[PDB]
């Protein structure tokens, strides 16, 4: 039993509007440099589709995540330590730039400088940001499949259509589409950390954010294959890999991530989750992959349980973090209401960015239909998005937890309609799904009204703990180049001293 904390995230796909605002803000702040222009730490994909990079969910092809060997031990799908090292001279599974898209720009200046007497109206043609050469045509982009862009037979190659008779969905009347925004899952059992030969990737103890040390990374580019979500992008210029940093500079002071605060649909929630680090391997190595979801819930600890609280304090968790954990919207959605589910738990990484499945228009039928258990509102069985597709995406193929989430959302709607339209109390739907009026009202508070203070409950990462914040406050930022940052040993060849430190020791004790 070793308690650690992390700010998890929940995205309500039912409220998702697939606008990509989250992607643009992240891009502007973190990846507008040459080398990562093609990398979208946060990217939104329209489903059905193969995504970015193409077919990233196909682990047989990309070799991401973990496998559970016959002896019960975990091993990266990429191979054990020796197998992985044997692939270092040329990663055989590495995604190529074309699996993402060839980054491009346009010759806008031609519009300004076109010479007098041009035979035709000047135009701005595409040019490659990789070679600087003219591109005859743009054939791919990071969001090429947006809103079912492409023939169904192409989009339907979607890994999540596995075990589903998808023919019926190629019919106009049965058309369906949803949005899947995603970033790094900042896993409890990250496959990236395990597949980096240099040990440059690590999970921060205090807030669970997973980072690639830009000093220590040696550019072995094996981690890219290791990540089953393909959320690590090689910086082709620096020769090192980069990934979503969960906006730690903001999180550290209690602010939401950029993609969370800028989410226009108001579908992202941030809240602390306390977990038992000592149970990570046991949970991730459970025999049946359909048990990974529940096994992970079992690693999450009850923040209102004095036993957990006292253990947390003993393990160094700050009081403000424990407090935040007690009013975590993420804990309520994943643990209490069972509305949020992990993304591909079968990869065995114990992801920390979860999703509430989306509702959808009722399916095509013979007639206009009849009043169901929910009156004029939909019954879970009538939704047009095949539940098996959602289960392949969130619960390793088990439709049970997906149906529960969807039914509970619809139940809340039924209950609230009786209240706001009929002015009556009708808990029939809630009782059918095991929800109390109090739970439905709280669900409504967080999901419908969704006040800012309720969507984001991020505590400080307390940078003052175990460090020296005073000298840092006084001297951080003066980047003159003292050459003494980044090492604990004081000796340095350039005979310098840290600008933000105190060299003259107190002699009065």
């Amino acid at each position: 039993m070793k308690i650690r904390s992390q700010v998890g995230m929940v995205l309500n796909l039912d409220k998702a509007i697939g606008c990509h605002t989250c992607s643009v803000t992240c891009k502007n702040v973190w990846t507008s440099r040459e080398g990562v222009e093609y990398a979208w730490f946060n990217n939104v994909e329209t489903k059905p589709g193969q995504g970015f990079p193409t077919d990233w969910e196909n682990q047989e092809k990309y070799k991401g995540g973990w496998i559970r060997k016959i002896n019960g031990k975990l091993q990266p799908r990429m191979g054990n330590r020796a197998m992985l090292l044997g692939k270092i001279f040329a990663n055989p599974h590495l995604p190529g730039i074309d699996d993402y898209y060839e980054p491009f720009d346009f010759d806008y200046q031609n519009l300004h400088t076109a010479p007098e007497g041009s035979k035709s109206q000047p135009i701005a043609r595409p040019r490659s940001l990789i070679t600087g050469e003219r591109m005859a045509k743009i054939e791919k982009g990071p969001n090429w499949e947006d809103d079912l862009g492409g023939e169904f037979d192409k989009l339907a190659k979607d890994k999540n259509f596995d075990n589903i008779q998808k023919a019926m969905y190629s019919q106009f009347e049965n058309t369906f589409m949803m949005y899947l925004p995603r970033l790094c899952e900042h896993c409890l059992n990250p496959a990236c950390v395990a597949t980096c030969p240099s040990g440059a990737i690590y999970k921060r103890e205090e807030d669970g954010i997973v980072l690639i040390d830009q000093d220590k990374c040696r550019g072995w580019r094996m981690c890219i294959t290791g990540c089953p979500y393909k959320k690590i992008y090689f910086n082709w210029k620096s020769g090192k890999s980069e990934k979503c940093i969960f906006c730690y500079p903001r999180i550290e002071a209690g602010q939401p991530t950029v993609c969370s605060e800028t989410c226009v649909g108001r579908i992202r929630y941030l809240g602390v989750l306390l977990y038992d680090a000592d149970a990570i391997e046991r949970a991730a190595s459970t025999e049946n992959e359909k048990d990974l979801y529940q096994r992970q819930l079992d690693v999450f600890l009850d923040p209102n349980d004095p036993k957990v609280i006292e253990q947390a304090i003993k393990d160094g968790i700050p009081l403000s973090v424990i407090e935040a954990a007690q009013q975590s919207p993420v804990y309520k959605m994943a643990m209490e209401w069972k509305l949020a589910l992990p993304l591909h738990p079968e990869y065995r990484t114990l992801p920390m960015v979860w999703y509430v499945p989306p509702l959808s228009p009722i399916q095509s039928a013979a007639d206009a239909g009849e009043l169901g258990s929910n009156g004029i509102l939909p019954d879970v069985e009538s939704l047009r998005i095949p539940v098996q597709y959602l289960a392949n995406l969130l619960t390793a193929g088990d439709t049970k937890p997906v149906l529960r989430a969807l039914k509970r959302m619809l139940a809340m709607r039924h209950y609230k309609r009786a209240e706001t339209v009929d002015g009556k109390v009708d808990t029939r739907a809630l009782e059918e799904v095991g929800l109390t009026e109090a739970q439905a009202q709280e669900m409504y508070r967080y999901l419908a009204i969704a006040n800012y203070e309720d969507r984001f409950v991020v505590p400080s990462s307390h940078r003052e703990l175990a460090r020296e914040a005073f000298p840092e406050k006084n001297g951080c930022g003066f980047t003159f180049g003292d050459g003494c940052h980044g090492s604990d040993t004081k000796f340095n060849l350039f005979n310098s001293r840290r600008i933000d430190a105190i060299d003259v020791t107190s002699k009065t004790e």
């Binding site: 650690r4 975990l74 330590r81 020796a82 992985l84 090292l85 270092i88 001279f89 040329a90 990663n91 055989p92 590495l94 995604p95 190529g96 730039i97 990789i130 070679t131 600087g132 050469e133 059992n189 990250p190 950390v193 395990a194 030969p197 240099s198 040990g199 990737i201 690590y202 999970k203 921060r204 103890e205 205090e206 830009q214 000093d215 220590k216 990374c217 040696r218 550019g219 072995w220 580019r221 090689f234 082709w236 210029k237 620096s238 020769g239 090192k240 680090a277 990570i280 703990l465 175990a466 460090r467 050459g483 980044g486 090492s487 340095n492 060849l493 350039f494």
Partner: protein, 225 residues
């Protein structure tokens, strides 16, 4: 000629070695962000699996052979490992590794120069260092027919004598090379030159061979610091 002889084989080796070491240390302490393998595979995966593996497996074979060949003291298992037996090992095993290395190297150089995406994103140092490695490997293979003229290991004895004198800081190392074929002279100079340029090129990735990974726990967590 005697002036150049002492310069290249008595003086130059220490200049190259000093630069190699202090340059590596200084770049490690002040250039961590520049310390990378500089993979270009993603930009063009074509032919890399074959080319890079041939080149690296070959070059590593050469390294192991060169290391034990020139640095192992004669008295160690002298009876079982006489100089002429070591030479045969070098010629056949080293020769084979050299062929793998050269083929891989040439394929990689062809790629770096003519694959638009790689050529457009390369640094001059990448082209220079690989070109010198290809030339050095070729020079090495070319010494084989010369070594073949002295299967009694006489030539190798001279070369090993020089190498050992240099690494143990014994002056007069160049005298060991008296009469050795010129081809060996060239190979040694280009070889030392590679050490000189080493810290200012991508070769620094060699220092980072991930040995610790083989016994490291899978999950890494960093505490507040």
């Amino acid at each position: 000629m005697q002036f150049l002889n002492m310069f290249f084989f008595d003086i130059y080796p220490y200049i190259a070695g000093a630069v190699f070491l202090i340059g590596s240390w200084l770049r490690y302490d002040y250039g961590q962000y520049t310390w990378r393998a500089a993979s270009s595979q993603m930009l063009d995966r074509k032919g890399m699996n074959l080319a890079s593996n041939l080149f690296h497996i070959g070059i590593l074979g050469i390294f192991v052979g060169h290391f034990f060949g020139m640095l192992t003291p004669h008295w160690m298992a002298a009876a079982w490992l006489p100089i002429e037996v070591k030479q045969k090992m070098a010629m056949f095993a080293g020769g084979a590794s050299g062929v793998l290395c050269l083929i891989g190297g040439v394929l990689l150089l062809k790629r770096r120069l003519f694959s638009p995406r790689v050529r457009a994103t390369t640094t001059g140092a990448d082209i220079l260092i690989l070109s010198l490695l290809v030339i050095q490997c070729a020079l090495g293979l070319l010494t084989i027919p010369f070594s073949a003229q002295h299967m009694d290991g006489s030539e190798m004895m001279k070369l090993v004598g020089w190498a050992q004198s240099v690494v143990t800081f014994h002056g007069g190392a160049s005298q060991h090379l008296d009469g050795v074929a010129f081809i060996f002279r060239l190979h040694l100079v280009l070889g030392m030159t590679l050490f000189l340029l080493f810290p200012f090129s991508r070769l620094i990735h060699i220092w980072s061979v991930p040995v610790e990974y083989l016994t490291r726990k899978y999950q890494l967590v960093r505490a507040r610091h």
